[PDB]
């Protein structure tokens, strides 16, 4: 996160770190045992780890569980981005309480001018890098449709839309991917992609969850 704040310790308790070895994507808890991440997050090996705030210490409300089935949206092209969806199933069910919480799903999609928070342990630079080890907050708008496709001209399709500052310094950026963007108590969004980090006229692309309820709603009941 460019321009953001420190969250405070478990504020975010939806928030999830995977892990391979290394802090590599973020992610969402939706449930006791399924995590919504980002397709091109997609590996083996992942631990999910849960209760995270700094990603370096243990701080006493982690729970560290290994994922069982990861499942990437049937349509996923990684050329263009399109569908940049997966789900995590969990070994185990996390143990939910105060600081480790799941996020609702949306019943409508959120609409151009809602006020959204994006979190993640991503660089915090937009020339040069710099990692924290605590978990970052960013408060963005969505953007209108109009102004995203005029930022992007032939690149945003109907499963994605634009959330942040065209005057820039303010973005999601490297190892913020898979992370929630959350408008009104509801996940909205999947940090997705961009041109750099926080740059003029370039602000991040989130995938569209709200169009993937009834994808992900089958595919938690059947596994
Ligand atoms: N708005 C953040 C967009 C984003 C997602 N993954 C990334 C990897 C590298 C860089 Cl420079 C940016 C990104
Ligand atoms: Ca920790």
Same mark, same amino acid.
Not at 17 to 34: D, M, T
Not at 98 to 117: D, E, K, M, N, W
Not at 204 to 220: F, H
């Given at each position: 996160?460019?321009?953001?704040?420190?969250?405070? %310790?478990?504020?975010?308790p /939806?928030?999830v770190?995977?892990?391979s070895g /290394?802090?590599? *994507?973020?992610?969402?808890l939706i #449930?006791?045992?399924?995590?919504?991440?980002?397709?091109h @997050?997609?590996?083996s090996?992942i631990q999910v780890?849960?209760?995270?705030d700094?990603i370096?210490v243990?701080?006493?409300?982690?729970?560290?569980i !290994? %994922?069982?089935?990861s499942?990437?949206?049937p349509?996923?092209?990684?050329?263009?981005?399109?569908?940049?969806?997966?789900?995590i199933?969990l070994?185990?069910?996390a !143990?939910?309480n105060s600081?480790?919480? !799941?996020?609702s799903?949306?019943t409508? *999609?959120a609409? %151009?001018?809602?006020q *959204?928070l994006i979190?993640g342990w991503?660089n915090?630079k937009?020339?040069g890098?710099? /990692?924290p =080890?605590?978990?970052?907050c960013?408060?963005?708008?969505?953007?209108?449709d109009?102004?995203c496709?005029s930022?992007?001209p032939?690149?945003?399709?109907?499963?994605?839309?634009?959330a942040?500052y065209?005057?820039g310094?303010? =973005?999601? @950026?490297?190892? =913020?991917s898979g992370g929630?963007?959350? *408008?009104?108590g509801k996940?909205?969004?999947?940090?997705?992609?961009?041109?750099?980090?926080a740059?003029?006229?370039?602000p991040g692309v989130y995938?569209?969850?709200c169009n /993937?309820?009834s994808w992900?709603?089958?595919?938690? %009941?059947? #596994?």
């Amino acid at each position: 996160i460019v321009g953001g704040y420190t969250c405070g %310790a478990n504020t975010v308790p /939806y928030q999830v770190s995977l892990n391979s070895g /290394y802090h590599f *994507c973020g992610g969402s808890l939706i #449930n006791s045992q399924w995590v919504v991440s980002a397709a091109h @997050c997609y590996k083996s090996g992942i631990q999910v780890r849960l209760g995270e705030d700094n990603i370096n210490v243990v701080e006493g409300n982690e729970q560290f569980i !290994s %994922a069982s089935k990861s499942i990437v949206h049937p349509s996923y092209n990684s050329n263009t981005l399109n569908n940049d969806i997966m789900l995590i199933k969990l070994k185990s069910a996390a !143990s939910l309480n105060s600081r480790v919480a !799941s996020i609702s799903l949306p019943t409508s *999609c959120a609409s %151009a001018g809602t006020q *959204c928070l994006i979190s993640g342990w991503g660089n915090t630079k937009s020339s040069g890098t710099s /990692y924290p =080890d605590v978990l970052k907050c960013l408060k963005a708008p969505i953007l209108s449709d109009s102004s995203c496709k005029s930022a992007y001209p032939g690149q945003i399709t109907s499963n994605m839309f634009c959330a942040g500052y065209l005057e820039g310094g303010k =973005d999601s @950026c490297q190892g =913020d991917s898979g992370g929630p963007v959350v *408008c009104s108590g509801k996940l909205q969004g999947i940090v997705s992609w961009g041109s750099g980090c926080a740059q003029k006229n370039k602000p991040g692309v989130y995938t569209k969850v709200c169009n /993937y309820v009834s994808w992900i709603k089958q595919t938690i %009941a059947s #596994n």
